[PDB]
From Swiss-Prot, chain A:
Gene name, Swiss-Prot/TrEMBL: Ptcd3
One Gene Ontology MF term: rRNA binding
Keywords: Acetylation, Mitochondrion, Repeat, Ribonucleoprotein, Ribosomal protein, RNA-binding, rRNA-binding, Transit peptide, Translation regulation
Repeat region (PPR), residues: 25-61, 62-102, 107-141
Function: Mitochondrial RNA-binding protein that has a role in mitochondrial translation.
Annotated source species: Mus musculus (Mouse)
Self-association state and partner proteins as the record states: Component of the mitochondrial ribosome small subunit (28S) which comprises a 12S rRNA and about 30 distinct proteins. Associated with the 12S mitochondrial rRNA (12S mt-rRNA).
Listed name of the protein: Small ribosomal subunit protein mS39
Swiss-Prot record, chain B:
Name by which UniProt lists this protein: Small ribosomal subunit protein uS14m
Annotated disulfide bonds: none
Subunit annotation: Component of the mitochondrial ribosome small subunit (28S) which comprises a 12S rRNA and about 30 distinct proteins. Interacts with LIAT1.
Principal location: mitochondrion
Organism: Mus musculus
The keyword Ribosomal protein appears for this protein: yes
Subcellular locations according to the entry: Mitochondrion
Swiss-Prot record, chain C:
Organism: Mus musculus (Mouse)
Main location: mitochondrion
Gene3D superfamilies (UniProt xref): Ribosomal protein S10 domain (3.30.70.600)
Protein name: Small ribosomal subunit protein uS10m
Encoding gene per record: Mrps10
UniProtKB keywords: Mitochondrion, Ribonucleoprotein, Ribosomal protein
Native organism taxonomy: Eukaryota, Metazoa, Chordata, Craniata, Vertebrata
Subcellular location: Mitochondrion
InterPro entries xref list: Ribosomal_uS10 (IPR001848), Ribosomal_uS10_dom (IPR027486), Ribosomal_uS10_dom_sf (IPR036838), Ribosomal_uS10m (IPR040055)
GO molecular function, one term: structural constituent of ribosome
UniProtKB/Swiss-Prot annotation, chain E:
Subcellular location: Mitochondrion
Family membership: Belongs to the mitochondrion-specific ribosomal protein mS31 family.
Subunit description: Component of the mitochondrial ribosome small subunit (28S) which comprises a 12S rRNA and about 30 distinct proteins.
Protein name: Small ribosomal subunit protein mS31
Residues of the full protein shown: 236 to 384 of 384
Domain of life: Eukaryota
Length: 152, 101, 140, 132, 149
């Protein structure tokens, strides 16, 4: 019923992960962010904090981890198109030239979602950056499956 | 089904010779020398005789694998002259041509 | 591709070991085929590949072999009437010189993977190594 | 008279392909070899086993593509790879060819324990070299 | 403003001074871990793009020969050595040290040493067969003045 209680509960599981000397993995953070996509409005500040904590621990954000942050910051059913967020530009700068490997089950989703946000923003320069990232190394393998390859 | 009952008998002769190859080698070695007592050699002459007749490898005949023809076979292809000519005259053997010179 | 080009193509990892490399004084590659033209095309591909990697190569044509045999033309009798068949083997020898073991593996893979159908190779590597350490010093 | 692999004359109404038109003595002169392996080269082994595989591979393709073969198939062995190049008439629907290619490749790769690939060039109809 | 890596973090966890202390295979791969790995592969599973990518997959699966060709790839005779194949007189100790049987077994072990089509285990089996054969024929040998074992 209450998000604040719900969030404090999920955090309690994380606190018991340190009491029992259990270290988190990529999936642990990806799971929390995938859950946060329900509360688009209130999950923005929590979502950024997780990614900062991911780097400090030493877990490397994968394409799936950004796929969730994008969904949370650029809603498809977004009425407020007047002043969209600028995070997508920073993410692409962060991932410029990097090569990625399969490390989660939502890695394919990232590329299809990134182009959609570009079409919504009508920024063709960003679309070239996203496509340029797809061509580096063997990133082409994470474009998506039959449903998402033709959408991208 | 094999081509005929003659090819079937030949196939069994080939599989019983493989079973008795080491045995017939070890026993026959005791006979093909002049270093062992003749009493042992006379007895080894009968142990080899007692083995089944189809274990003997000289009862194998090379037959065309496709027509089971006993004579006329070419050992490199295992085919009779008649079957070989049919494949050769149709361009189906790799590198076989007619000899003109 | 006119506008869409790979950016940073991934290349295999080649790690230099600490073991010393083999030294091949000579490396003779005898290709065989029923067709002379295929050997000519393979000779051009192999000589071009060697020259591009820095390898020293020479080529000659060992004498061809023709194997002929006779058969009976008819299915029954008519002994005097026969049919003769032949198989022709042609050779091209690619003699390479002064190759390290890393250069000979990459070259042989590249040319063996591109060996046409109906072509047989016979590599004859000639390695050069020092004397055994025991043999170096006479010990009674 | 010689009767071997010779498509005899009729009254000018018998279509014959390039392969059929030429008698055995034109092998290596006007027409090449349908199968190309290294087993008949000098000092090479396993001619018998390559030849038996060819006989079967030809009977398999005739039955698997019944009435859909425009000419005899060409077999090409490189290393352990086998390559089957067949001229096929455009009788069957396109999707049926994809099924028979997947089936015939997998079945022959598990039967001879080699990688086998099928290469199909579709013709609108049989190509006639001459009418004899 | 919305800096991805500048700002407050949850801070529930601490910097990993110790990293990956427990080994990855803490137990033999469970069904849960074996099945998740199969799904990770499917994430990047795309069809072959050319003959090179097809050949790359065949090689990893053993379907296609490795290059340059090695005619003895995967053919190790029990990790034996040349001295094991060539020097076989250790196995003739049970036999008489001299006499006709020794003269015969010398010829047998000489041929076995020159045999490239048998493994050491098979060669030993040939020697063992003769040991049991002569043991059975002890009485005939004794008549001929040959003493076996
Ligand atoms: Mg019958
Ligand atoms: Mg005989």
């Amino acid at each position: 019923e209450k998000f604040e209680e719900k969030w404090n509960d999920i955090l309690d599981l994380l606190k018991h992960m340190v009491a029992q000397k259990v270290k988190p993995n990529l999936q642990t953070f990806n799971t929390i962010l995938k859950g946060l996509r329900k509360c688009y409005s209130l999950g923005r500040i929590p979502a950024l904090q997780i990614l900062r904590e991911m780097k400090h621990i030493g877990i490397e954000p994968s394409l799936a981890t950004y796929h969730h942050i994008i969904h949370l910051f650029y809603p498809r059913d977004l009425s407020a198109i007047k002043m969209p967020s600028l995070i997508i530009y920073d993410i692409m700068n962060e991932l410029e030239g990097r090569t990625f490997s399969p490390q989660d089950l939502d890695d394919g989703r990232f590329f299809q979602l990134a182009m959609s946000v570009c079409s919504s923003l009508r920024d063709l320069e960003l679309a070239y950056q996203v496509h340029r990232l797809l061509n580096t190394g063997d990133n082409r393998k994470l474009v998506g499956h039959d449903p998402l390859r033709k959408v991208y | 089904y094999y081509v005929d009952w003659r090819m079937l008998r030949d196939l069994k002769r080939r599989k019983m010779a493989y079973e008795y190859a080491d045995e017939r080698l070890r026993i026959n070695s005791l006979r093909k020398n002049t270093i062992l007592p003749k009493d042992l050699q006379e007895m080894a002459g009968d142990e080899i005789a007692a083995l089944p007749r189809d274990s003997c490898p000289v009862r194998i005949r090379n037959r065309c694998v496709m027509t089971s023809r006993p004579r006329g076979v070419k050992r490199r292809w295992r085919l009779s002259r008649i079957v070989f000519r049919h494949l050769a005259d149709h361009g189906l053997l790799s590198g076989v041509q007619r000899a003109i010179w | 591709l006119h506008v869409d080009v790979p950016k940073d193509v991934t290349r295999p990892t080649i790690t230099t070991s600490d073991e010393p490399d083999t030294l091949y004084k000579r490396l003779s590659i005898l290709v065989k085929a029923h067709d002379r033209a295929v050997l000519d095309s393979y000779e051009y591909f192999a000589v071009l590949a060697a020259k591009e990697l820095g390898i020293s190569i020479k080529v000659h044509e060992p004498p061809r072999k023709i194997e002929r045999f006779t058969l009976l033309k008819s299915v029954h009798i008519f002994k005097k009437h026969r049919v003769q068949y032949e198989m022709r083997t042609l050779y091209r020898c690619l003699e390479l010189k002064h190759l390290t073991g890393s250069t000979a593996s990459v070259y042989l893979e590249y040319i063996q993977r591109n060996l046409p159908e109906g072509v047989a190779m016979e590599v004859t590597k000639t390695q050069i190594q020092q004397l055994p350490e025991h043999i170096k010093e006479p010990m009674w | 008279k010689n009767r071997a692999a010779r498509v005899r004359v009729a009254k000018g109404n018998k279509p014959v392909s390039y392969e059929e038109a030429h008698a055995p003595h034109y092998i290596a002169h006007r027409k090449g070899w349908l199968s190309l392996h290294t087993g008949n080269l000098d000092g090479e082994d396993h001619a018998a086993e390559r030849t038996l595989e060819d006989v079967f591979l030809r009977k398999f393709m005739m039955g698997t593509f019944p009435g859909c073969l425009a000419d005899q198939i060409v077999l090409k062995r490189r290393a352990n790879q086998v390559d089957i190049c067949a001229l096929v008439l455009r009788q069957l629907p396109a999707h049926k060819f994809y099924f028979l290619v997947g089936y015939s490749e997998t079945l022959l790769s598990h039967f001879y324990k080699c990688p086998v690939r099928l290469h199909l060039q579709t013709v609108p109809s049989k190509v006639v070299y001459k009418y004899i | 403003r919305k800096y991805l890596f500048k700002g407050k973090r949850l801070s529930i966890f601490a910097d990993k001074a110790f990293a990956d202390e427990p080994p990855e295979p803490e137990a033999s791969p469970s069904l849960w871990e074996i099945e998740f790995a199969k799904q990770l592969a499917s994430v990047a599973d795309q069809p072959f793009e050319n003959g090179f990518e097809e050949m790359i997959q065949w090689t990893k699966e053993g379907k296609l020969w490795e290059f340059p060709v090695n005619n003895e790839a995967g053919l190790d005779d029990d990790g034996s050595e040349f001295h094991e194949h060539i020097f076989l007189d250790k196995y003739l100790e049970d036999f008489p040290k001299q006499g006709p049987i020794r003269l015969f077994m010398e010829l047998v072990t000489c041929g076995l040493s020159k045999n490239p089509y048998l493994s050491v285990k098979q060669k030993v089996e040939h020697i063992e067969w003769f040991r049991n054969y002569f043991n059975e024929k002890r009485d005939i040998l004794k008549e001929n003045n040959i003493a076996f074992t």
